[PDB]
Design a protein around this ligand. Structure first.
Ligand SMILES: Nc1ncnc2c1ncn2[C@@H]1O[C@H](COP(=O)(O)OP(=O)(O)NP(=O)(O)O)[C@@H](O)[C@@H]1O
Ligand SMILES: [Mg+2]
Length: 1020
C-alpha cells in the first residue's frame, strides 16, 4: 500500500521505466521532530549524527555510540533523558567520576530552565559526597525519579532496588566492563533475569541501552550485549590520520633534533630505550624546556599539560602508563622518533620463542625446499625449522625490501608502534582531523629505508625529507588545533549508509578505519565506524535486492507499445526484508552511498536502491575498481549518480535471458518431456562448436615419434633417415603480453593451473574482495597511471611504459600492490594484510596475475628462433622452433614455448609411431578464446555459459578436454534444426554488441527491445 513519492512505479513490485502521504516515513518521525525542536531550546541545532541516535532510541534500539569527538554525545544523552522523562518514561545515566555526575545534574536543570518544569519529582542524583539528609532523601524517593544520574560505582553496589529504566545511558563503557557483574546488573535493570535452572536467561527488553565505544580490553563478557541487544561494542581508536611524516638519516642531538625543536613546542620525543632516553635529557636541557617520564617519576606530565614544560622525552612503553595512554589533542602538536621503532631477533636467538613467530622467519627466504614446511601440519614442528635456520642465513641474503639482513641478524621495522606513536599527533573531531607531524630520525641507513618501505604497506605512510615548509607547518598545527578547540561549532562529519554487495567487502571496508561497532537489524548486519569523510555504516545487500518477476506482463515485461520492467523481492529468508531493513538505515542516515561492483549489475543495484529508498536521503554512487582504503577514499571524493546507461544495458541483457531463455528452454521440455533442460542461445552456439571439434577428432591417426629429438612428423614409418637442413636463425626481441583480462585470465587459469572457469571466477572474486587485485570482470587491458607506478616500484630499470589499450573506462585485472605471491603470504602470516578465507589456490592464482602484469610492464625480451627444414621419404617439411629465450619478462611470464634444439644430421632414426586424432577436442581454455575471437559472450558471462553446459549434462570432460554427450547433442541438433535462426552465430554476435552499444549510450534500449519482443513472439 504505497502512494506518493504496494507496487511503486516511476514496494510489492517495483514497476519501473528509467529516465498523499510520504514514502520514507517512520512512526517515531513525529516523535522525533518534537525532540529536535526541544533540543533546539536546550542546546541548539541537533547534529546529523545526534538526530540519527534519537531515532535509534525513539525506536528502543540498543547500540554502541561510536563517533568523532566534539559531537554532542553527552549532551544528547542528558537531553534525550530529560525528553523521555517529560514523557514519563524514566532514564538512567551512568558516569565514571563524581564530578561528571554533578556536572550532569546541573546540565539538566539548565535545560529545564527553558520552558521545562524542573520539579523535584523529576531528577535525582547520587555520589560519594552528599551528607546524612540528602543521601536519605535520595534512597527513600529513588523510583519516583524520572531521571537518575549516578557514578558507575553505585551500580555494582546497588543494582537491585533501582527500579528499571526505559533508557539507560553509559558515558564511559570501560567504567563498566571492568567488573563482569556490572553487565548482568545492567541487563537486569532492563528486564533480563538470569535463570540458574536453564543456566541461560530469557527476558523481554524493558528498555534500551546506549554506550560509548571501549578503549581498554574487550572481554568475552561484552559478548553478552550481542546475544541480548544485538550489538558489539568495538574500539574508539579509529585508525585515520593527517600527519606530516618526515624522514631524516641523521639523529644528531645537535644540528637536527634541536633544529626541529624550532617547530614551536609541545613535541613528544620517543627514544629506543629508557637508557637512551635519559641520555638525551642532559644532551638537551639548556635549549628548550624539557621533561622526562617513567616508572621512576612523572610530574613532568602535569608540567607539560600545564605549560611549564614545552616537550617530552620517553618511551613507547612508558608514555602509555600515563592517563589515557597520554592523550592531549590540544597540547601535543608533533612527535619526533629518535631511532626507528624496531623489533629484533638474533641468529643465536632462534631456539626458544613462539612457534607462530618461527613461521614468519620461515618465509623471508624459500630459495631451497623450505616451502616444504610452508604447507604444514603447521607443527611439522618449528624445531626442524629453527635448526634449518641456524645452518643457513649468514651467507644467504634475502630479497625482501621491508627488513634488513646485514650478516646474521634480522631487523624488523615496527610500524604498529609508529602509527600509534604519531597518532597522538592527529585526532578526529567534529571539525575534521587535526594536522599532525612525525619526525623519524635514524642513523642506520639500511634500516631507515626498510621502515620507509614497510610504511608503504600501511598506505598513507609516505615520508618527506625536511623539504618541509616549517613556517607553514607550525601554523597549520597551531591553526588546526585551534579548530578542535572550536569543535563545538562543526558538523562536517555526518552518517552515510555505505552499501556494498557481500559481507566480506563489508568487513574489509569497515575495518579499513578501525574496529567498527556492530548492530544486527531485523534483516541485516551493519558495521559502523567514523572517519574523516563520514560516519560510515557499511552494510551488505547480499547481492541483488530484486530481480525480474515471472508472472506480471510478458515474462516479466508489461508490453503493448510499452516495455516496462517489473521487479520483485527475491527467493529461508526473503530479500524483501533486507529492503525493509535498508530503508530504515537509509531513513536514519538521510544519505546513501552504494559501492557495489563497478559493472552494470553493480549499477543495477544502486539503481534499484536509488528507487526503493526514495524520500529517505540522497543516494550517490561510489565507484572504485579495487577494494582498498586508498581507492575507497578516492571514491569518497568523486561520487556520481547512478549511470542510467549501464542500468539499461543491465536491463535489456536481463530481459533477453528471460525471454529467449525461457521460451527456448520450454521448447526443450515440450519435446521428449524432461524438464531440468536448458537453452541459452550463447550456449547452444558454443555447444555447437564443442561438437564441430569432436567429430573432427576421430581421424588422421598418422604421426611418428623420434626418440632423441623432440620431433613429431606426420609420417607412418618406424625407422628411417631424416635430414635436418638449418636454414634461418634470427634473434628477435619484443614486447610481452598485455595485462590479464577476464578472458585471458580464465584461459591461463585453465592451461597452467587446472582450474575450471567457474572456479577461477570464484577465486578471482574473493581475490578482488580482499583488496589484492583490481576488479575481475573486465574486457579492457588498460593500465591506470597508478598501476604503472606499481610495476615501476617492483621492476625498476626493467620497467617500461605501455598503457595497453586506450578505450572504454575499464581497466585490466592486476595486483593492487607490488607484492609477489610470497610477500603476500608472508604479510598475511605477519598480520600486515588481513584477509578472509584464502587457500593455496588463491595465491596459486594471485601468482599468475602478478606475473602477467609485471611482465606487461617489463622490458622487451630476447628470444632465439631456429628454423629447420626436414626432408624424408620424398616429403620435406619445414618448421621453426624456439631454442632459447632470456630476460626478465620471461623469468616472470613464460609466454613462449622453448622446445628442444636439435643439431643437424642425416642419421638413423627410431620412431615409436602412433594413431593420433586429426585434432584434439577443445579445452575450457581454447573454447574460451573462441568465444572472444568469434564474438560471443562477455566477461560477466564467459564462465557461466561454459559452466551451464556441464551442469545440464550437455558436456563432460575427459583427459581434461571437453566432450559432448548424446543428451546434449540431441539437444543441440534440436534447436539447430528448427530454430537455427534464433541461435545463429551472427544473430548472437550482433545482438551481443547491441548491448555493449546500449551500454555505451549509442543504441536505444526501447528500439532495442522491439526487435527483441518481435523476434520472440515470432514463435511465442
Ligand atoms: N548539536 C549541538 N549544537 C550546538 N552545540 C552543541 C550541540 N551538541 C552539543 N553541544 C555543546 O557542546 C558542549 C559539549 O557537549 P557534551 O555533552 O559535553 O559533548 P561531548 O562532545 O560528548 N564532549 P567531548 O567529546 O568530551 O568534547 C556543550 O557546551 C554543548 O552541549
Ligand atoms: Mg565524556
Amino acid at each position: 500500500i504505497p502512494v506518493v513519492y504496494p507496487v511503486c512505479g516511476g514496494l510489492e513490485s517495483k514497476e519501473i521505466e528509467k529516465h498523499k502521504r510520504s514514502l520514507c516515513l517512520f512512526p517515531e518521525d513525529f516523535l522525533l521532530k518534537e525532540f529536535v525542536e526541544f533540543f533546539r531550546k536546550c542546546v541548539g541545532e541537533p547534529r546529523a549524527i545526534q538526530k540519527m541516535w534519537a531515532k535509534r532510541i525513539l525506536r528502543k534500539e540498543s547500540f554502541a555510540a561510536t563517533a568523532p569527538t566534539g559531537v554532542g554525545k553527552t549532551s544528547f544523552g542528558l537531553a534525550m533523558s530529560l525528553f523521555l522523562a517529560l514523557k514519563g518514561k524514566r532514564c538512567y545515566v551512568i558516569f565514571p567520576t563524581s564530578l561528571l555526575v554533578i556536572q550532569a545534574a546541573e546540565t539538566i536543570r539548565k535545560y529545564a530552565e527553558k520552558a521545562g518544569v524542573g520539579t523535584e519529582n523529576l531528577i535525582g542524583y547520587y555520589h560519594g559526597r552528599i551528607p546524612k539528609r540528602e543521601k536519605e532523601n535520595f534512597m527513600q524517593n529513588l523510583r519516583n525519579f524520572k531521571i537518575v544520574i549516578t557514578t558507575t560505582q553505585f551500580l555494582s553496589k546497588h543494582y537491585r532496588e533501582l527500579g528499571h529504566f526505559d533508557f539507560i545511558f553509559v558515558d564511559d563503557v570501560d567504567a563498566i566492563l571492568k567488573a563482569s557483574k556490572n553487565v548482568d546488573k545492567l541487563l537486569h535493570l532492563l528486564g533480563f533475569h538470569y535463570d540458574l535452572k536453564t543456566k541461560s536467561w530469557v527476558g523481554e527488553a524493558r528498555g534500551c541501552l546506549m554506550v560509548s565505544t571501549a578503549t581498554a580490553k574487550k572481554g568475552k563478557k561484552a559478548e553478552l550485549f550481542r546475544q541480548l541487544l544485538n550489538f558489539d561494542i568495538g574500539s574508539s581508536r579509529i585508525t585515520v590520520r593527517n600527519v606530516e611524516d618526515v624522514a631524516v638519516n641523521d639523529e644528531s642531538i645537535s644540528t637536527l633534533s634541536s633544529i626541529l625543536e624550532k617547530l614551536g613546542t609541545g613535541g613528544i620525543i620517543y627514544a629506543r630505550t629508557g637508557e637512551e632516553a635519559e641520555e638525551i635529557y642532559e644532551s638537551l636541557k639548556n635549549k628548550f624546556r624539557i621533561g622526562i617520564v617513567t616508572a621512576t617519576k612523572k610530574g613532568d606530565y602535569e608540567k607539560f599539560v600545564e605549560g611549564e614544560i614545552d616537550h617530552l622525552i620517553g618511551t613507547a612503553h612508558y608514555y602509555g602508563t600515563l592517563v589515557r595512554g597520554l592523550d592531549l589533542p590540544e597540547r601535543i602538536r608533533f612527535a619526533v622518533f629518535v631511532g626507528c621503532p624496531s623489533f629484533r631477533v638474533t641468529i643465536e636467538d632462534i631456539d626458544s620463542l613462539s612457534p607462530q613467530m618461527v613461521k614468519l622467519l620461515a618465509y623471508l627466504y624459500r630459495n631451497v625446499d623450505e616451502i616444504e614446511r610452508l604447507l604444514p601440519a603447521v607443527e611439522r614442528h618449528i624445531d626442524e625449522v629453527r635448526e634449518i635456520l641456524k645452518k643457513v642465513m649468514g651467507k644467504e641474503r634475502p630479497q625482501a625490501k621491508d627488513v634488513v639482513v646485514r650478516e646474521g641478524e634480522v631487523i624488523f621495522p615496527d610500524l604498529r608502534t609508529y602509527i600509534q606513536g604519531s597518532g597522538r599527533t592527529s585526532r578526529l573531531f567534529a571539525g575534521g582531523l587535526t594536522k599532525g607531524a612525525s619526525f623519524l630520525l635514524e642513523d642506520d641507513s639500511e634500516l631507515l629505508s626498510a621502515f620507509i618501505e614497510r610504511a608503504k604497506l600501511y598506505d598513507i605512510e609516505f615520508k618527506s625529507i625536511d623539504e618541509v615548509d616549517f613556517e607553514k607547518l607550525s601554523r597549520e598545527l597551531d591553526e588546526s588545533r585551534d579548530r578542535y578547540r572550536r569543535r563545538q561549532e562543526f558538523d562536517l562529519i555526518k552518517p552515510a549508509l555505505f552499501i556494498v554487495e557481500s559481507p566480506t567487502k563489508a568487513r574489509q571496508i569497515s575495518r579499513f578505519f578501525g574496529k567498527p561497532s556492530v548492530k544486527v537489524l531485523d534483516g541485516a548486519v551493519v558495521y559502523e565506524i567514523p572517519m574523516q569523510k563520514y560516519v560510515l555504516m557499511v552494510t551488505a545487500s547480499i547481492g541483488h535486492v530484486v530481480d525480474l518477476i515471472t508472472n506480471r506482463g510478458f515474462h516479466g515485461v508489461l508490453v503493448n507499445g510499452r516495455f516496462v520492467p517489473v521487479y520483485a523481492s527475491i527467493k529461508v529468508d526473503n530479500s524483501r526484508s533486507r529492503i525493509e531493513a535498508l530503508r530504515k538505515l537509509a531513513h536514519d542516515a538521510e544519505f546513501v552511498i552504494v559501492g557495489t561492483d563497478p559493472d552494470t549489475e553493480g549499477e543495477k543495484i544502486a539503481w534499484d536502491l536509488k528507487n526503493l529508498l526514495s524520500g529517505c536521503g540522497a543516494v550517490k554512487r561510489a565507484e572504485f575498481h579495487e577494494v582498498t582504503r586508498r581507492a575507497i577514499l578516492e571514491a569518497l571524493e568523486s561520487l556520481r549518480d547512478v549511470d542510467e546507461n549501464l542500468v539499461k544495458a543491465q536491463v535489456v541483457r536481463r530481459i533477453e535471458d528471460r525471454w529467449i531463455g525461457f521460451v527456448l528452454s520450454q521448447k526443450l521440455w515440450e519435446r521428449f518431456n524432461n524438464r531440468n533442460l536448458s537453452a541459452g542461445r550463447a550456449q547452444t552456439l558454443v555447444l555447437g562448436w564443442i561438437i564441430d571439434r569432436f567429430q573432427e577428432s576421430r581421424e588422421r591417426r598418422k604421426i611418428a615419434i623420434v626418440r632423441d629429438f623432440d620431433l613429431v612428423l606426420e609420417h607412418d614409418e618406424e625407422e628411417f633417415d631424416l635430414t635436418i637442413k638449418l636454414v634461418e636463425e634470427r634473434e628477435e626481441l619484443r614486447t610481452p603480453l598485455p595485462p590479464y583480462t577476464t578472458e585471458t585470465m580464465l584461459s591461463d587459469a585453465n592451461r597452467i593451473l587446472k582450474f575450471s572457469v567457474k572456479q577461477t571466477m570464484q577465486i578471482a572474486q574473493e581475490l578482488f574482495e580482499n583488496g589484492l587485485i583490481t576488479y575481475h570482470r573486465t574486457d579492457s587491458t588498460r593500465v591506470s597511471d597508478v598501476g604503472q607506478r606499481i610495476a615501476k616500484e617492483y621492476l625498476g630499470d626493467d620497467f617500461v611504459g605501455r598503457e595497453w589499450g586506450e578505450s572504454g573506462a575499464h581497466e585490466c585485472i592486476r595486483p593492487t600492490r607490488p607484492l609477489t605471491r610470497d610477500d603476500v603470504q608472508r604479510l598475511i602470516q605477519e598480520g600486515v594484510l588481513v584477509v578472509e578465507g584464502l587457500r593455496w589456490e588463491h595465491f596459486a592464482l594471485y601468482d599468475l596475475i602478478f606475473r602477467r602484469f609485471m611482465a606487461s610492464q617489463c622490458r622487451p625480451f630476447k628470444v632465439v628462433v631456429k628454423k629447420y627444414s626436414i626432408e624424408f621419404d620424398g616429403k620435406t617439411a619445414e618448421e621453426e622452433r624456439i631454442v632459447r629465450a632470456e630476460g626478465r619478462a620471461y623469468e616472470l611470464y613464460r609466454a613462449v614455448w622453448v622446445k628442444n634444439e636439435l643439431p643437424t644430421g642425416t642419421f638413423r632414426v627410431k620412431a615409436e609411431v602412433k594413431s593420433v586424432p586429426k585434432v584434439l577436442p577443445f579445452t575450457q581454455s581454447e573454447i574460451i578464446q573462441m568465444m572472444k575471437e568469434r564474438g560471443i559472450g562477455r566477461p560477466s558471462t564467459y564462465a557461466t555459459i561454459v559452466d551451464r553446459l556441464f551442469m545440464r549434462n550437455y558436456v563432460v570432460e575427459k583427459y581434461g578436454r571437453m566432450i559432448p554427450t548424446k543428451l546434449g547433442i540431441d539437444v543441440f541438433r534440436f534447436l539447430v534444426r528448427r530454430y537455427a535462426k534464433f541461435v545463429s552465430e551472427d544473430r548472437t554476435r550482433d545482438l551481443e554488441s547491441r548491448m555493449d552499444a546500449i551500454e555505451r549510450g549509442e543504441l536505444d534500449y526501447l528500439k532495442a527491445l522491439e526487435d527483441m519482443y518481435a523476434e520472440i513472439k515470432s514463435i511465442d
